[PDB]
Symmetry: C2
Subunit: 417 residues, 2 copies
Amino acid sequence: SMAHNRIRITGARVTPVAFADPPLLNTVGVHQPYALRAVIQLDTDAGLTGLGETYADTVHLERLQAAAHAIVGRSVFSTNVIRALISDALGGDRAGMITSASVVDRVFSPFEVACLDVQGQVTGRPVSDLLGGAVRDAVPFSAYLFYKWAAHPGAEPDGWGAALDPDGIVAQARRMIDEYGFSAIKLKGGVFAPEEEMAAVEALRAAFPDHPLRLDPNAAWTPQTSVKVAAGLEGVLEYLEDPTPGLDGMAEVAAQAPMPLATNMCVVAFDQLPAAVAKNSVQVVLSDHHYWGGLQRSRLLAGICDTFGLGLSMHSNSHLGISLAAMVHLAAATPNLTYACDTHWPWRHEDVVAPGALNFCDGEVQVPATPGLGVEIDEDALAALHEQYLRCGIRDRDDTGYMRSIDPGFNASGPRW
Amino acid sequence: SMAHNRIRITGARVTPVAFADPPLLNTVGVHQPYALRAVIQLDTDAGLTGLGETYADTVHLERLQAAAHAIVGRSVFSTNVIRALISDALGGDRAGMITSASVVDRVFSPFEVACLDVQGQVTGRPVSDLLGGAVRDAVPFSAYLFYKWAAHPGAEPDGWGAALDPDGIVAQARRMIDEYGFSAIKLKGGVFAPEEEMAAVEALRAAFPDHPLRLDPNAAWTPQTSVKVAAGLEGVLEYLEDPTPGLDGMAEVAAQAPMPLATNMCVVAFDQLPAAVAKNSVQVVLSDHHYWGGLQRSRLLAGICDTFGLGLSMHSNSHLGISLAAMVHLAAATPNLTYACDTHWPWRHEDVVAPGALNFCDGEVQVPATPGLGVEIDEDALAALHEQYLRCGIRDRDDTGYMRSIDPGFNASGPRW
Ligand SMILES: [Cl-]
Ligand SMILES: [Cl-]
């Protein structure tokens, strides 16, 4: 029942939340005990509210407020206009660099997802129907393995236990795969010497002979080291992700690697694709709607990759059920997204949405068929995680700073090997 | 009122039509007295019918029937799936070459447009709202000028008169621009010697000092000739379109031309973009939803161009009101489509849709705000143009064959100069 056949934005509520995260290691530090996210509730003059989810660093929250103010009074179907208004509001210029356009896309993304959610709700269509329609019923995900301590310093150890060697990594895989059924496995490396990470990979291969395997050391290696690793893992990895820093280095490694190289670090914005393509630095690009500017722009990224002969996967950061629902609709509607998607899901145990719509079964999530994004806010859960945010005092993600608070001389050097 | 919240295709009616066309000249011949199109009426189990419009050559009609049969039983929101089914049905492989994928896109396009029309109708949204939303209220078009005979042989001369020199071309512009208000002007060249076409361009510039101007000889020139033309028209043309054949030749000319080069001939499919981009052959690509695979894929083309630093315009072939409505919604929703679009509109005087929704005023068409494509079939007009198709006996477009039926020794050689 829309006057003037118009459904437009009346305001947005941005709610920062914090949820428990284990001490997962990576090449620059260790995860803090709480990860942060911002929930966007986008309100309209039809009484329909759409959901989006993004980062929650201090500067980002400020940008999210400026954005929320700039788009009041806009149709939820006018997402092109909404991006431009956010660009004007941020005073933006509309490899691996966060350009002004990259900032605009990170700020626009959660509003775009919330807009599509409202679009789906008002039309009776699932979000995947707004993206060309689902091409598969369910979206497969990977088991995202990390070396980890047993506990945050001075806190109760979690149920995972530590993983600091091949045995520990294999036990982690077994527990994760029994609970979720993942049929592909990714190891976060750049933490131990390459030979020890190769050994974890070989051990996973022996324990799970049919699981595709990936390794991502976040550019912790020189090109010369990366080529040795790639030779040593020939026929073992589905792809090698960001072994070494920079497009030139990646191109050098790619020329010698028997498996494809993937990246999320060198290509995080549209303006970075032409150089990545010209240099042959990578064969697979990891999508991520959270920094590419929402779902429609992620579909554009997928079409560009297809056109230029690049494979397509999906990158993840610690996230909750709103992001998960958006990931699933996006992947369901993307013909060339055939790699299993990364997710941090197993690492959290809290959420802001009502349960039931995002069950994993055999490693995959069925795409919801209901109108909109397919999940709804649980206001009590949201208030609780907001309260947790206020009380835990963490205001920015800082893996390195947190590592230094424990080990003051720690450096986030790289490459390390 | 959709059972299972499902609206799916029950069948398609393909109706070939023919409408009067003047004897317009181009570098390969002269237009036949009737141009051909196929109207797609896409029927659904909700009783909503969507409209699409495409070519009507013999082989294309056959492909359109195979496509219509393959997609019965599919949701109009499942356009990704529908393209894949058409690809399977055609047994397809899913510069300027008509690859199997290009064939698939030409066949899919009118069904995709008809699907979006149904989507808009069922959701209450104009098609532009399905493409990210309009960013402008009206879409500007160009005056598409041609050298022409006074009449088809043995027929009544049309009201335009002949145009065979600069004076005739200027008089044609004046009549067209008084009727339609176009604020940009394009000349179809490759018909007379370049020096005479340069003179028509200079005469248009003198007669319309503020109108952007374009010239397109359909690759009738050598690179050396093209550079002379471009030097001689420095500061006069908004772009020079397809002056010379092949990506290498275009790149040679582009390096010396003071204005951007445009193309529709060298880049007509997604698989042709990487080489065009790598060679620097062009600065502007002409979109055309009729062969790029419908509106969503045209939005993808627009995003690829934006990403790789290419300007975006729009190409046209003789067409009716269904294509016109689709062109307008597409252009309204495309932020980087800022060149005036080409259209053959002034050259016909017949249509298959009810009048009123596509008025030109000051060179531009307001984007319809109604649900769907915004135009509807006039069944009497459609029957009449179908009857005209059957009776006129023309079954394929053949500018060269028709020129030879008048002048047997005629050759479609090129380049000519
Ligand atoms: Cl608006
Ligand atoms: Cl279907």
